[PDB]
């Protein structure tokens with residue numbers, strides 16, 4: 001029993017982290033096979049309106065210093081794919097895991113391995129917000145740190161860190177260099193859009209709570225999907241879809257509580273608050289656990 | 304910016320996890336050099352009053368099946384140190400990190416690598432509670448999972464998981480087999496004692512909040528250590544010591560807020576609640592971040 005914000009074991013990713021230096025800028029890169037991936041803004045000198053095509057044409061391989069621990073890797077090629085720089089190196093990473101690159105949907109969670117100067121610092125879990133920012137923990141030097149999920153022994157990379165926005169939340173790309181959200185790797189007035197709460201995740205966490213013995217929020221009522229969504233939109237929650245209801249199926253079956261029954265609990269909680277009580281140690285409704293996350297942690301999958 | 308419950312990178316520990324099987328019982332072991340450590344209750348058949356001296360005398364080396372991935376390790380010796388079994392194996396772990404064994408004080412935090420059948424599942428952070436339990440996330444099969452801190456590249460192991468108590472919290476030992484708290488590895492009526500909140504940690508997290516721009520709880524007042532402790536004891540908080548005040552020094556200096564000034568804020572928060580506001584994303588006062596944890600994450604140390 002118990003329920004914690006749990007990240008994936010990070011070792012397979014630690015073995016891929018390197019330091020990329022271009023000029024006076026240093027950040028992190030991801031070394032898989034004979035290629036190092038990193039944010040293309042490593043080539044900028046500080047930026048208002050950079051032309052990265054021009055900036056990269058003016059670089060050579062010798063301008064890129066890649067260090068894996070203390071061993072310097074020799075850069076033998078360099079190209080640009082969207083907002084990611086790919087540096088071909090002359091030796092393949094002997095620690096390359098089985099991996100793939102995936103672009104996730106908002107509401108999905110992943111583990112972040114925060115890194116500085118190519119050295120892992122810490123691991124934590126977060127979600128892709130509906131407004132395509134993440135609420136991470138990132139200091140200067142963290143650019144190029146990656147987010148990932150692990151299935152079997154395959155690492156699915158889904159995030160590379162590029163920027164902190166003015167509100168202190170974070171923006172980045174998939175491993176093909178495409179930003180999540182409307183953001184651009186430049187200094188402009190861009191800001192995080194209005195966010196919403198991830199309804200299906202909140203319901204997943206309520207199921208997690210029941211599995212762990214928190215039942216005080218349950219009630220005898222059921223609601224209709226349409227009438228629940230009426231309340232969801234009023235409290236700035238994402239609409240619940242039949243896809244979401246179907247995804248909550250296995251948890252609904254383990255606990256014997258129908259999805260629309262649990263929706264009636266969430267409506268009550270939104271309308272009345274918790275009256276000084278807590279759920280799984282929280283005084284607010286938690287929305288960064290997916291249904292998969294709840295089953296994984298409350299049933300026990302390993303990697 | 305940002306502030307997350309951050310665990311240490313787990314890879315150095317993943318390389319040490321193995322499966323120990325004795326009879327029909329399977330759990331996890333920790334393989335360092337040519338020794339595998341695991342909870343001694345792996346030799347029990349289910350237990351009301353086990354005599355582990357008798358139970359171990361009746362075992363041989365061949366009763367212990369140790370698997371590191373798929374490679375079976377040959378057990379060449381077996382002994383008992385307090386509540387931990389030590390199985391000498393015929394090959395040293397090639398992935399042994401620089402390590403040491405430490406026994407921590409209540410209020411200290413560590414990362415847990417939850418494991419099943421020798422395979423890492425997930426990593427999370429927790430604190431040793433004042434009542435010497437931890438609020439972990441542990442399913443059947445998790446015994447022998449370890450907790451640790453990492454400094455430089457040295458892993459300090461401080462917890463091995465032995466038991467879930469009736470309230471769903473967890474009990475275990477240091478890596479020398481000594482339980483934290485009064486617990487015993489037997490089936491009895493033992494229960495978690497009354498817990499308290501870790502005051503110095505709460506203050507550390509309030510400093511973390513200021514560093515991250517949450518200032519609404521600050522005020523012009525200061526309190527005396529004695530008058531603060533008067534309020535602490537009323538709300539079931541641990542007494543604040545001059546050692547604690549001194550430990551909060553560097554954070555007090557970075558923010559320019561005196562410890563006893565911050566204590567006045569905490570008194571106000573205990574007496575009045577938050578009035579619907581949050582701090583670092585929480586609606587309750589968080590107490591599982593040490594002062595070291597705050598400096599590490601708000602300043603940037605790596606390993």
Ligand SMILES: N#Cc1ccccc1-c1cc(-c2cc(Cl)cc(Cl)c2)c(=O)n(-c2cccnc2)c1
Nearest residue numbers: 025027041138139140141142143163164185186
């Ligand atoms: N690492 C690194 C680094 C190294 C040298 C120089 C600058 C950086 C950098 C650059 C950006 C940035 C910001 C914008 Cl608005 C647009 C663009 Cl293109 C890049 C940034 O956000 N951070 C950062 C800081 C804190 C948390 N998270 C990310 C650090």
Ligand SMILES: N#Cc1ccccc1-c1cc(-c2cc(Cl)cc(Cl)c2)c(=O)n(-c2cccnc2)c1
Nearest residue numbers: 328330344441442443444445446466467488489
């Ligand atoms: N693994 C494992 C395992 C394998 C085979 C048989 C039993 C176990 C076991 C044994 C104990 C236990 C409990 C008490 Cl009260 C006293 C003693 Cl000596 C041991 C236990 O608590 N768990 C457990 C369960 C859930 C979360 N965390 C810990 C699992």
